[PDB]
A paper describes a structure:
However, we obtained crystals for the human apo-Cep104 ZNF domain (S763E mutant) and solved its structure by X-ray crystallography to a resolution of 1.8 Å. The S763E mutation was used since we found it to improve the solubility of the protein. The residue S763 is located at the loop connecting the β hairpin to the α helix of the first ZNF. The Cep104 ZNF structure consists of four tandem C2HC Zn fingers that pack together to form a single globular domain that, to our knowledge, represents a novel, previously unobserved arrangement of Zn fingers. The individual Zn fingers are variants of the classical C2H2 ZNFs in which the last Zn-coordinating residue is Cys instead of His. They consist of a β hairpin followed by an α helix that packs on it. The Zn ion is coordinated by two Cys residues located on the hairpin and by His and Cys residues from the helix with the exception of ZNF3 and ZNF4, in which the last Zn-coordinating Cys is located at a loop region downstream of the C-terminal helix cap (left). In the Cep104 domain, the sequence separation between the individual ZNFs is variable and increases from two residues between ZNF1 and ZNF2 to eight residues between ZNF3 and ZNF4. The strict conservation of these residues suggests that the compact globular shape of this domain is not due to crystal packing but that the four C2HC Cep104 ZNFs probably function as an integral, single unit. Consistent with this notion is that this domain shows a continuous patch of surface conservation that probably constitutes a protein-protein interaction interface for its binding partners.
Cep104 is a key factor involved in cilia formation and length regulation that rides on the ends of elongating and shrinking cilia. It is mutated in Joubert syndrome, a genetically heterogeneous ciliopathy. Here we provide structural and biochemical data that Cep104 contains a tubulin-binding TOG (tumor overexpressed gene) domain and a novel C2HC zinc finger array. We have structurally characterized two of these domains, a central tubulin-binding TOG (tumor overexpressed gene) domain and a C-terminal domain consisting of an array of four Zn fingers (ZNF domain).
Numbering used by the authors: 743 to 875
Write the structure that this text describes.
C-alpha cells in the first residue's frame, strides 16, 4: 500500500511524536531541549541519542580520548578513574546486546529492542535518571 508522500514530515524519528510545530527547525529545538529519547552530552555539548550515548562517548565525542570502556558494565568511564572503577567492582554487569538493552543513565539491563527503549525512557515509572522527564 502507498506510503504517504509526507510521512517522514512533522515527525521526530527518535521519540515518534508528531506535531505541527515540528518544522525543520521546530525539530532542532525539540532535540536540543525536549525529546525524551535524547540528551545533551555534558562533555562536548552535542545532542546524542541516549541509546547511543556509551558508543558516542567512546568513539565519537570530542572528548572520547578521555574515556575508557569498563569491560564489566560496558559503559564509558573517565580514563583516570577506570582502574579504581574496575577494582571496586560495583558497577552493574552488562549482558549481550542481543539479550538486553542497557540504560547508560540508570545502569539497568532490560528487554532488548527499540520499543523497550521508548518504554524505558518515556513510559510511566520507567527511567528515574532521565532529566528531561
Ligand atoms: Zn523526539
Ligand atoms: Zn560528547
Ligand atoms: Zn564498570
Ligand atoms: Zn534508565
Amino acid at each position: 500500500p502507498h506510503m504517504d508522500e509526507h510521512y517522514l514530515d512533522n515527525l521526530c524519528i527518535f521519540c515518534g511524536e508528531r506535531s505541527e510545530e515540528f518544522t525543520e527547525e521546530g525539530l532542532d529545538l525539540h532535540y536540543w531541549k525536549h525529546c525524551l529519547m535524547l540528551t545533551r552530552c555534558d562533555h562536548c555539548k552535542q545532542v546524542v541519542e541516549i541509546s547511543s550515548l556509551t558508543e558516542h562517548l567512546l568513539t565519537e565525542c570530542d572528548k572520547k580520548d578521555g574515556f575508557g570502556k569498563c569491560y564489566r558494565c560496558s559503559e564509558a568511564v573517565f580514563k583516570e578513574e577506570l582502574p579504581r572503577h574496575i577494582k571496586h567492582k560495583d558497577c552493574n554487569p552488562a549482558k549481550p546486546e542481543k539479550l538486553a538493552n542497557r540504560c547508560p543513565l540508570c545502569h539497568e539491563n532490560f528487554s532488548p529492542g527499540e520499543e523497550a527503549w521508548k518504554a524505558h525512557l518515556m513510559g510511566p515509572a520507567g527511567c528515574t535518571m532521565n532529566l528531561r522527564k
